[model samples]
Target chain A: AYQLPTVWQDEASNQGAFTGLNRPTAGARFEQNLPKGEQAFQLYSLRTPNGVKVTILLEELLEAGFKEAAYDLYKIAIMDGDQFGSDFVKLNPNSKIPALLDQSGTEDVRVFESAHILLYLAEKFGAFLPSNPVERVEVLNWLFWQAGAAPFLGGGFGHFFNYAPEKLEYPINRFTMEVKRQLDLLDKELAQKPYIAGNDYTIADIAIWSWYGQLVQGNLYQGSAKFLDASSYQNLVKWAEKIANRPAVKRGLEVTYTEIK
Target chain B: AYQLPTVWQDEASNQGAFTGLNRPTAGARFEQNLPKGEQAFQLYSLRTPNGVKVTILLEELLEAGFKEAAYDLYKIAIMDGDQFGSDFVKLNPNSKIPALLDQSGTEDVRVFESAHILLYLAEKFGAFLPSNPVERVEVLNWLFWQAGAAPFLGGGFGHFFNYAPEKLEYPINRFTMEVKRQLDLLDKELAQKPYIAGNDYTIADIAIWSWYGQLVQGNLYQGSAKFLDASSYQNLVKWAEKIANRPAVKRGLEVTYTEIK
Candidate 1:
């Protein structure tokens, strides 16, 4: 059998090569063409950490009287490469799910990425984002933290802990080290503050809550609850519980989720 | 000699496990303390993509005559694990660089994440971000896209391509597929708009510029230029060139960067 290099070996080695299975299909098929008459935003997504953030944010905005904040949820399965469709890619060149097409304005505007969508909706409706300068920066720092660090947790830790077909010692050990360190880091940070960005519950809280909150609550990637000891993040847990108790958050998580059950 | 699982097998068996070594170091020993100061805005950062975003934003703010926006830069050596220190972790539990300490208001505030930092700084300074609702959402969407998707490019593709000790095919293929798809995705988007968020130079532009711009300009990751055909991203190339010409951006790119010559 011919041996190929590891994914870690070369970032650019596989440029044009296609292995067939799991390859994303190109060309527009599932273009989101919501009628312009509709006032609600059309969220094309699947139930994932990133996807849930947007749904929750939308629910929060709708409740806050951005009545124009209604949504039609369309599933764009990443596993099946639905995001690669011509139209979906047009909305978000990144070709990932949780893309938003807002028809409330003169022209339909597209918003992709969960955290960005949360910040967008929050800013547009003037709710979750703090108006104060310092408070706003503090909130954003945590939101960006979620954006920059999560891949290690989800793409790194979650992959080895649960998704990989088999368990290997090196990756498990490596990711475990980082994920554990990250958990401890959060635990320590939460210990000092009540919420991720102080007392306020802004989009930062919502953005982080979708991922770290789930990990701590033992809700995502089954069998990973122990490796990271997510519960050890006492402050994070406390903050997550507070946000979890919100009615809008509950509806948002539910609507955007895949409902594996 | 003990034989570890090949990178390809590791990816096939578990994708997350395979992406670990590509990540920066993790351990409590690498953590360090931040120098406390009374600057209106104190930024602790290194020169990495995540760190540069905030520094660049701050430079932009300062250029706008927001004298209160002075910041202090702290170099966090991720390779050496400086981000894991107890003090650093306290500021940002995630332990990533580019954490911010905002003490302008009633109490000290901490923020993490580059995109969030950009948003926070823009809001704090009242520049960069668009005022209109649709424009704001569009800008945020692009910002979030950078946060959520960059990992596959930096940590994932970067590891496989440049960081890993030996080349492997699976990871190279997996990340290459994703990265190329991402580049093409951006190319298509840039084709239609002048900037990532329509015609304006928003925080989203800053967010994307740090990575894609660097990639196209052949600055950040070594060997990535020829590998990704950096020139193929014509629109992104054009956008990067325009932004690179900005005085603030030029200065920001130099904040943590040491000229090799």
Candidate 2:
């Protein structure tokens, strides 16, 4: 019983859990400096899927004998609105977590967007991502795939299924359909290749496993795995478990953080 | 009133447009062959924002004197289900349009994902993307930004606002808030720098202009520009217009297509 309007306006009523945190605008709300640490890489993140992508890669880099990949970690507590601070805004104008500063360089280089952080670390350390053009593009194909695909799972299906105030049937159905299609695509591909891109574990795996891998492991959107019948995609679950068992991946998930005071 | 179910089942009722086309699974439904041409690049795409992203870049490469960027364009009519054709599925397993085959190489390198196509072409021709490390990462930040951001706009806002079976207030409000935030983010960035990444126009511009550019120009999701108050973001409107007037962008938008007849 709704109708389209000539102009859209923000609904004043409580929309969902993050109603106060959500806004129709962008920019730093307060002037505050971020804490600096003496490390090669400085990460401001939480342990969500997007956040763990960088941590997994960083840990993998260290595990791969890249000692220069040492890092410091901090949490930008979204519940208290740490992302809107001026320093964080300058680091990531979009104001999302898992932003990185590559202090290993001649100057501090800002890297934002979780997948982009994965790629940046991969390129800088010359690991995970393949050097061969064909193999590299394959890795990139899936890397970008995760970037474009996860919104449906996280923001669409997860939002409607887990976060929305009421269970809206239409939105749930719309996003559920797309999420299943994505899982099927991944399952089919993984049935052939051991890793997402090819023979070796790459940043593509790190980016994807952060989301889909966790989902099938029964970690995301309470009861979503059961609802989606994730086990039906046997190949994907096998791959997810294989990735999850990695020491670096386990540490990535277990990473401790100091919350901004 | 809606209640939670232990397991999810497909909602058989009419979801919206393309209900018949969409499935909870992916793979070729029917076997069909694709047409090829003598051009170095074989682009199978439609002229949606994602599709035009590739065409725009290809056209830009040609305009920049890289005739090697010359290509053939073929349409994968989503409405007619051309994307599910066997050959197209092989080209892009995800069954999305704007898949590219770089025939110029010794092997037919397959590239899916619109932003990946842009990066691949840019790296191949050594144009658009910057060579300097700092400049390159900046461009990449925004490039990946678009890849992640657009779903909230295209799949979320656009779908609920324009294509849904009913005018659901919750979803329309949810996505509109995010879309406006995205616009504000871009507008704020553009207010400081002339281009998205930096001073020079890179592939980031091409990728962003295709979506946000088209939106502010009042070209996408009829009345969306007015609904979002797109004109109020003067800097974004300025950048959108500036990018729109470019010859290559015009040609990219005007590029004629041959359907798989």
- Give the C-alpha interface root-mean-square deviation per candidate: 6.6, 1.0
TM-scores for all predictions: 0.78, 0.99
| Candidate 2, pairs of clashing residues | none
Where is the poorest 10-residue window by lDDT in model 1 chain B?
A: B5-14
| List of chain B TM-scores, one per candidate | 0.86, 0.98
CA lDDT scores, all candidates in order: 0.70, 0.91
In candidate 1, stretches whose alpha carbon ends up further than 4 angstroms from where it belongs are: A1-39, A58-70, A79-81, A125-133, A160-169, A192-194, A200-202, A226-250, A256-261, B1-39, B60-71, B79-81, B84-87, B102-107, B255-261
lDDT of 1: 0.70
Q: Could you report the DockQ of all the candidates, in the order they appear? A: 0.30, 0.82
Write model 2 residue lDDT over A150-198, tens digit each, in one string: 9999999999998888898889988988999999999999999999888
- What lDDT tens digits, residue by residue, belong to model 1 across residues A1-261? 225422122333322222332333234555444222254577778888988888888888887777777777777767665776666766776667778888766787887777777777777778989898667766777676777778878766676556654464545555566666656656666777777777867887788888888888878877566655556567778877888899999998877432211
True-vs-predicted CA distance for residue A22, candidate 1, Å: 5.8
